[PDB]
């Protein structure tokens, strides 16, 4: 649904 | 013979991947020379991941905020800026695996090398291409941010993409290495959807002509058309229109092949009509866009299996 | 999000490619330590392609006859040995960029990148499956002998094939790396063919799991059967038998998704009986059959996309 | 119809 930034926590 | 998603060998860019964390934020970064690039996205935090202004959050940091490293060893960030959504951090210690390079923006329909990267180790390769709506149908999971993707000319690699997010459709977006979005993209978690994509026509008929190449030749037909006909039943079927440049383009494989491009054009019309009626191409049961013209030649045998 | 044919990062396998010439033939060569591998065709004469007793051959050769150049350094080769259908070349000088490495062969049904090579220098990187009957369906020209396969597991190098040749049907023959080949084939150009192939019904089915995970449910149904009518209806496909052992590797794969094997076998056998009615799936239009299990686990995300 | 190994000369 919505944008997903693929950084790492 | 034989005809596969080739990608170009990653080595001259494996040695340029490095790990990037800032908080608790870690993604990928690529070290050319004295500079690390990444995602500007590593500084953003958690709750501002909605609307993030990033000039607001880079002037909260100092160099010693940013942790770099090269497999076991830490650079120490001399130096940081901002550069639209891609992020330069000066580090003390030039590359020395630093290959000749360039930073060059593609065109939709253009393919490269995806070198997929976690924690700043590479994991995988793969070849695709920049859509007419400016996604690329990637493979990518958390912490791949930063990734880039590339074309090798001559030892010379230049770098094209930056990977940055994931849309809803499942599909990939990002930069090209000055930080610029391909498309109409942003580097927030917002609704922003892929648009309509179209299938990229120069590409298809390249991949026809491998085809040829490689002994598939049961599609082929005695009809030819003209450039406009063709081009009414393209559009009808959500293709790119074909120009003379692409025919030009498409000139050294149809001499090749002895096929010429109008007379391929009546092939795909056909098939775009018929179907493939339980019949493969290439080892394909679909019309294969991923492939440009220059990509063709480079894997085919210069001579035609006749 | 997302599923591509990806390949392991090939560095670690272009800083050992190196090329050999003896007399007018040349080819690639692997480089490991003090010693290069490379196929033993490169000693054979244009007019013993037929039929050429190799131990003859090596026997008429010596150490200088045999021009071994990395990049643009040339190795001095100070002794030569055959090992079954690879020819070992011990040179003067240890590669420096030798990785951990190891000499496994494969399976069929299990999959490798190659690293597609020409003039000792690396042209391209992809990944295939060593088919049922041991031929692979590569990309390789003229030249490309000597190329190796292998699949990297924490920065260690598990080569598993070195390419000798293509048969008539334009599919390709080779050896592992201490010479033996896979498949009933031989180094000498005569009437050799491929035998029959199979599908590996495994393979197709983890991809059937990758397609779930990333949100292809379309070919799903209520439906369970037993591991015997499954095979029953397999066999009339030229599908492999599924064995429990299969089973169990889908496992993991099967607990993900919430999928037991044998309902995702049903949807197999639909697919099989019915096609798939214009429908794709991870944008193939025929069932794909050269990712493993373990290949899925490693590029799909740990949590399915619910 | 024939084998071909890929070696170049």
């Known amino acids: 649904l919505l944008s997903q930034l693929q950084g790492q926590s | 013979s034989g005809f596969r998603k080739m990608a170009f060998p990653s080595g001259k860019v494996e040695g340029c991947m490095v790990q990037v964390t800032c908080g608790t934020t870690t993604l990928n970064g690529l070290w050319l020379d004295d500079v690390v690039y990444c995602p500007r996205a590593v500084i953003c935090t958690s709750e501002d991941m909605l609307n993030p202004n990033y000039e607001d959050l880079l002037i909260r940091k100092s160099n010693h905020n940013f942790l770099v490293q090269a497999g076991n060893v830490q650079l120490r960030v001399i130096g940081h800026s901002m550069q639209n959504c891609v992020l330069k951090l000066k580090v003390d210690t030039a590359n020395p695996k630093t290959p000749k390079y ?152 149809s001499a090749q092949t002895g096929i010429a491009v109008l007379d391929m054009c009546a092939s795909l019309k056909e098939l775009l009509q018929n179907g493939m009626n339980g019949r493969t191409i290439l080892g394909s049961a679909l019309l294969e866009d991923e492939f440009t013209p220059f990509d063709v030649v480079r894997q085919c045998s210069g001579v035609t299996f006749q």
């Not at chain 2, 229109?241 to 494989?253: A, E, K």
């Open chain 2, 102 to 253: 360039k930073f060059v923006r593609i065109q939709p329909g253009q393919t490269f090398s995806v070198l997929a990267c976690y924690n700043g180790s590479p994991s995988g390769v793969y070849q695709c291409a920049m859509r007419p709506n400016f996604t690329i149908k990637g493979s990518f999971l958390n912490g791949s941010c930063g990734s880039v993707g590339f074309n090798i000319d001559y030892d010379c690699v230049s770098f094209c993409y930056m990977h940055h997010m994931e849309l809803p459709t499942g599909v990939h977006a990002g930069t090209d290495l000055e930080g610029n979005f391909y498309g109409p993209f942003v580097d927030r978690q917002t609704a922003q959807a892929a648009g309509t994509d179209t299938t990229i026509t120069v590409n298809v008929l390249a991949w026809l002509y491998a085809a040829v190449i490689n002994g598939d030749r049961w599609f082929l037909n005695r009809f030819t058309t003209t450039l406009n006909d063709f081009n009414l039943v393209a559009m009808k079927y959500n293709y790119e229109p074909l120009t003379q440049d692409h025919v030009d383009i498409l000139g050294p494989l």
